[PDB]
Amino acid sequence: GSHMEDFVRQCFNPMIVELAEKAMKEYGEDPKIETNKFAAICTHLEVCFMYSDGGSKHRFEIIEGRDRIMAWTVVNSICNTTGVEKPKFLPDLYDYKENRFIEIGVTRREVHIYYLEKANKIKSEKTHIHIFSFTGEEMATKADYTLDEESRARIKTRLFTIRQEMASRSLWDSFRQSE
Amino acid sequence: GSHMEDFVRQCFNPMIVELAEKAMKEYGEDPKIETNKFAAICTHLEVCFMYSDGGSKHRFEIIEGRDRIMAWTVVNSICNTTGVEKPKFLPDLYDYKENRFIEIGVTRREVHIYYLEKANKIKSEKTHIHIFSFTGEEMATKADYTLDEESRARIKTRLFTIRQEMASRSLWDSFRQSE
Amino acid sequence: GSHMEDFVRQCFNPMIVELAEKAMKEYGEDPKIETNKFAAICTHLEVCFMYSDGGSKHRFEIIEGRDRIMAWTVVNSICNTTGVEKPKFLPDLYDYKENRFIEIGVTRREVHIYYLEKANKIKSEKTHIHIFSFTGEEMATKADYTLDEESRARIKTRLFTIRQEMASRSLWDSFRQSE
Amino acid sequence: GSHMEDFVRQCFNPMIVELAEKAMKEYGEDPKIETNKFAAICTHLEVCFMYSDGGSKHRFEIIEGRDRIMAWTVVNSICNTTGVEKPKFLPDLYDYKENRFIEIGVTRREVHIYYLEKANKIKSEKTHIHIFSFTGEEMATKADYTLDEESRARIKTRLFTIRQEMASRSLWDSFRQSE
Amino acid sequence: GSHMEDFVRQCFNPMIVELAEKAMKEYGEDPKIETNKFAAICTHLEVCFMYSDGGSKHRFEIIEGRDRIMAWTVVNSICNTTGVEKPKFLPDLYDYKENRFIEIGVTRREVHIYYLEKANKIKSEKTHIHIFSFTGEEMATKADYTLDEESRARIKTRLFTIRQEMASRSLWDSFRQSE
Amino acid sequence: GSHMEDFVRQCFNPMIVELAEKAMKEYGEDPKIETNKFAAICTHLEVCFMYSDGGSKHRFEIIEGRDRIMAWTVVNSICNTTGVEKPKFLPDLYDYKENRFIEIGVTRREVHIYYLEKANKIKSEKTHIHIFSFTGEEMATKADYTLDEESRARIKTRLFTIRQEMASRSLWDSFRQSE
Amino acid sequence: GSHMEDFVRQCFNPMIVELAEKAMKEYGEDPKIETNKFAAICTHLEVCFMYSDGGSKHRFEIIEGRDRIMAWTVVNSICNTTGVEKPKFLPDLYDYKENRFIEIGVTRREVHIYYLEKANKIKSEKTHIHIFSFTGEEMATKADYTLDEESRARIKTRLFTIRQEMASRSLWDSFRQSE
Amino acid sequence: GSHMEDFVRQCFNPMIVELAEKAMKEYGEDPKIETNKFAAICTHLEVCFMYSDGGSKHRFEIIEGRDRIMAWTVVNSICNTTGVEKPKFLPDLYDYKENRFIEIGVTRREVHIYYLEKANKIKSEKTHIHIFSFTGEEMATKADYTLDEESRARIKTRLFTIRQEMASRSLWDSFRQSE
Ligand SMILES: COc1cc(CCNC(=O)c2[nH]c(-c3ccccc3C(F)(F)F)nc(=O)c2O)ccn1
Ligand SMILES: COc1cc(CCNC(=O)c2[nH]c(-c3ccccc3C(F)(F)F)nc(=O)c2O)ccn1
Ligand SMILES: COc1cc(CCNC(=O)c2[nH]c(-c3ccccc3C(F)(F)F)nc(=O)c2O)ccn1
Ligand SMILES: COc1cc(CCNC(=O)c2[nH]c(-c3ccccc3C(F)(F)F)nc(=O)c2O)ccn1
Ligand SMILES: COc1cc(CCNC(=O)c2[nH]c(-c3ccccc3C(F)(F)F)nc(=O)c2O)ccn1
Ligand SMILES: COc1cc(CCNC(=O)c2[nH]c(-c3ccccc3C(F)(F)F)nc(=O)c2O)ccn1
Ligand SMILES: COc1cc(CCNC(=O)c2[nH]c(-c3ccccc3C(F)(F)F)nc(=O)c2O)ccn1
Ligand SMILES: [Mn+2]
Ligand SMILES: [Mn+2]
Ligand SMILES: [Mn+2]
């Protein structure tokens, strides 16, 4: 095994790791080789899980963490009961309170570049966009950050905790220069 | 076993299935033969469970999911402590906040026909009526939908998810044309 | 064993029964003989448990359900940190929100007689008094019922459910004419 | 073993004891000899745990209960995402709602002496200070007690319960005259 | 509810009760009315469970405790892999060590009458027969009791414990004169 | 609380302690006062539990650890299915393999004095007698020690471990000179 | 989803299904399309699990159910501590008692054809071969069936139970004519 | 953290890791620095755990995995009930069947050098000695290996699995050249 893989298994809880292994394998990647992609999907999975935990009881429908067909089924059921436009690509969450899907991005570049690139890929204007980064900076559409400051600051802290742990194990540099 | 039965056991959590088996057998039906009635009572059971989960901590007394005699006991205790009129037929919930019983219907026809038919069977005007359907449409008495928009839209989504899963297994058509 | 005892073990959850057995034995009574006292302390224990569950997260300190010495220790710690007067007899709860102890009574007589008798035994005016009965009637000091209408009506319903179950087993009559 | 140690193991839940054993051993002390320091760190650990439980869902980041390096990592991540000043010594909590770290002290002297001594050791003015004592008295910076009266009064009661239990076992006197 | 029913729920573990409720309802009986049949199937279910527990690790295939169709499926699979004759009626166990099915009877008459009646109903000579009674007497085909003396004497004791508990609750007499 | 009581709660697992509290209270004693009797019944309870664990799967019926009436019920069922003589006093176990009841004694005197005294109290010759002591010495009827040397030596070790723990807490001397 | 897939999820316990999903995806297959291969690997996984359960406590090292690299690691450790020849292909078990690896095959053809084909693929003579089929027939190298008759007959029964369940759902025919 | 530490946490189950952390800290070492000593005590802990699992039900008293004082207490109780000589240093197990203590060594040198060195340190001839190594070789006193070949070969395999995992992570070389 790799050094990064062992770090992934000791920093992220097992359920998040199992979902990341299932997600990458459903797209042909192997967690034991593309190990920094392994850490990325784990990090992205934890961020969305904390994000939907930031609301009430059932404000959010979690799209991420399901296989492509079941995730599109919930997308279909959401679209064809609320009336919203079906997105071109799979989002990560659906905000019932705000009646909009959310795409959540976790980047190691500037929140400006990453938002611009995914806002380009999305093109469909309806779905909300919300980016975090491993430095503590965040950016959202219309500056509408959906959650309150306390929930989002928990996410920024967890991200900086991961970058710190990667650096003390000498794996942050390759993780940075691999996105 | 039937194909529908296997779908029922893999789509609804085991506790809901056990309650549905107990409910149908207490009325002489067998889940392994009347399999689309098996899916209906499971669907109806999940909807009411989500419905009472939509309130505070103890807003709702769940009438559905108990055997006829224990369910009438709670109905008696509710009626003879609050003062409300004892219903002619067994409701599904009791709203303490609103001081009224609720009958919850899940239909594959128009919410208008199904409401009209059960409002006819109820006749007793006190108990509230609330219908959902597998298309995302809902209808309630006095347009009083009891729950907020977020909780009810979760129920509509789950219903459309079930219809989608039934269709990909070729069982939605017989399920539709069997109510 | 007795018929009432078997009913007590099948109607009240095991933790409440274990506490009732411990409470009665600490005062020389045996649950297997004084069986209707066994049902009374179980009923009284469940009512107080639902009562403190009716508040926020930690509004209530539960006095009932502890042995005499540990219960007086919490009473001491409560009195000697808030400043309230130490009661002559052991209460059942302590309301931090209202800064007062509560004595909870469950009776099979008129709420008026039972309140009057315990208000006589208490004499110390500080601690709040709140009575329920197996008919759905309640009475509290200064008409201050502490909890909201939804929480108290849950307690009245549970009480009428117990009386109904006792009656169908022919044990309500002796339970009534034994208090 | 010591008498105090046995009391520590029977009064504090095992998870708090395990954390206290880990905390003291990471600083060269042995719980089986410095047994009243063993009770102190257990008491301090429970107080902070109740303290962060006094907020919403994720108002507080718990600093206490982690080893020195992981605790400083969260401190780093907190500081370098919110922007606050990194404290000279390890605090116990971080209040996101109030955007400030908290140092929690549990003393057997006057809240005035203990606050003054730690306010002297801290010197860095940013982090909040909050002291409790085994008599029910508390003191906080700017008289800003962070939590509501109900949560803090739970902590004062638990403290007086511990002192009472220590006294009936003859160990309060040495515990007092050892801080 | 009945007095016997409450005794059934407090003497037999819940899994055995659930199986008995499922078994009787699959044959049109209601546990709440035919309550002594309810105790009989519970007693019969526990005896067979102890019986198969009396062997090695996987000496016995349990036929009892499954619904009619799944029980016949295992009967089919057993018959059509070992080669034994398929029985006319559903047995309770299958002994691999001895290569024979077992029918287990629990009676309140003489082991001689009960064996004779079921040996008459079976007619198919292959399947083994083994009877216990609430007095401690047992009888098996060819005097081949399958299990050792220690396992069978546990079953006789449990049976006499049940009869004793029924008698102190005044329900043994009707239970006896109802088979 | 007492020092011995705290030692009892930290040395014996909670289930054994709960049984000891129930056993002593059923005979009018209070664990918080007669604390060395509290340790004795706990020690006696653990020894019998290890003893019956020393056999096969179901060699032993545990008589100890039940209340007087349920323990006599099993005694009745054992006697009136095996045919053995019903003992004058309650034994602790029943050996099916050897077809005899066992009385287990744990003493702090010489195994000779303790055996002689209980062999005097028993008088009924049928039931087996087996004594252990906190020094590692054991004595059984006809020198028939029922279990193998490995199981009995585990019991002697556990006993000497308890005496050692009591001595380091200064409570062995009063425990010795109290039997 | 497919009808076979739903049957796979309701007939095999979830841990076996998760392993089968992981095993097939590690070789590029998707359980939701190659659904009868999905049932085959599940069936093969359960058979090997029952097989190693047929021995003592730790007679067998399970090779099947691990990913290719971890399975080869145990193969390496086994070979390079016992001294046996490292097999050309991955076996399913390692028998320590017999000091040989085992390849377990579950077929829907004649045990003769399936054994011959895999004995051809293995070529390395050391590793043992053991075939079962859905009719109850088995064949092993040197007629050495490793396990006793009771354990192997459990496996044959489970296999015939699966074929029966597949047939009543109309999926046995395609499952047969797909190997 | 270190790379080795992350490997230790992902290869050994958490209970073994917690014991190793407690064992090293009780002797002044820190698992996060002396990380290959961290892997050694974990490996040594797992080997002894498998070793005592290799016997009957209670053949072995586990000495390793307790703190120095509690481990010496069991040593005292063992010595002063069986009569064996108290060892100069703490052993790892006590074999009741063979009436002797066992010292278990796991080495990365030749089993001959390691045995000779510890046989020199022990000097007390009574206690048995048993060495394993990461190559699959073992050596015991009088060639008495206590366990059967199947149990010991499981231990040799697990050891070679650990060395393989260390090598693929580049940490075996420093682990070898550090003993
Ligand atoms: C699992 O791997 C995948 C998966 C897909 C399809 C489903 N994925 C999303 O819907 C998706 N994917 C990404 C992403 C994209 C490229 C590299 C890494 C990631 C990242 F962050 F996961 F780590 N970010 C999101 O935020 C996001 O919602 C495509 C490609 N790779
Ligand atoms: C379990 O089967 C039954 C049960 C009964 C008596 C108790 N039932 C209700 O009280 C009830 N029954 C129905 C319903 C009615 C006919 C077919 C299907 C259903 C449906 F939806 F369950 F699937 N809808 C409700 O909403 C509802 O509250 C009558 C008949 N069948
Ligand atoms: C357990 O039995 C006891 C206990 C005590 C001392 C502690 N008890 C209370 O503090 C107490 N006792 C009663 C009560 C009094 C008489 C009969 C029955 C009850 C009742 F309801 F429990 F069922 N009601 C309360 O509300 C109440 O707080 C005295 C006498 N009996
Ligand atoms: C575990 O033992 C230790 C630990 C440290 C470093 C980490 N500790 C804190 O950060 C800390 N330490 C104390 C404290 C100080 C001296 C004696 C006792 C305590 C007390 F209360 F724990 F019991 N109080 C706090 O409030 C507090 O946050 C220093 C010294 N001893
Ligand atoms: C559940 O109720 C039923 C079930 C059936 C069909 C399946 N049953 C058996 O296969 C069966 N049935 C009986 C039995 C027969 C009559 C009354 C009571 C019982 C008894 F003991 F359960 F309590 N004894 C056995 O030993 C036995 O194997 C027939 C009738 N009633
Ligand atoms: C719980 O307290 C009791 C209980 C009883 C009746 C039931 N007890 C037994 O059947 C019994 N009682 C004793 C024993 C006797 C006197 C003092 C202490 C014990 C001892 F060891 F428990 F600690 N030893 C046995 O071995 C034994 O089987 C009588 C008296 N006290
Ligand atoms: C935890 O660390 C320690 C502990 C002690 C005292 C208690 N220890 C034993 O009783 C002991 N110690 C060793 C050992 C010795 C030196 C280095 C590494 C180990 C090894 F293998 F743990 F990894 N081997 C055994 O087999 C053994 O029974 C001394 C020194 N270090
Ligand atoms: Mn996504
Ligand atoms: Mn995303
Ligand atoms: Mn209904």
Ligand SMILES: [Mn+2]
């Ligand atoms: Mn309805």
Ligand SMILES: [Mn+2]
């Ligand atoms: Mn009270």
Ligand SMILES: [Mn+2]
């Ligand atoms: Mn009261």
Ligand SMILES: [Mn+2]
């Ligand atoms: Mn601190």
Ligand SMILES: [Mn+2]
């Ligand atoms: Mn502090």
Ligand SMILES: [Mn+2]
């Ligand atoms: Mn049967």
Ligand SMILES: [Mn+2]
């Ligand atoms: Mn039968």
Ligand SMILES: [Mn+2]
């Ligand atoms: Mn006794």
Ligand SMILES: [Mn+2]
């Ligand atoms: Mn005894």
Ligand SMILES: [Mn+2]
């Ligand atoms: Mn194979």
Ligand SMILES: [Mn+2]
């Ligand atoms: Mn050692």
Ligand SMILES: [Mn+2]
């Ligand atoms: Mn060693």
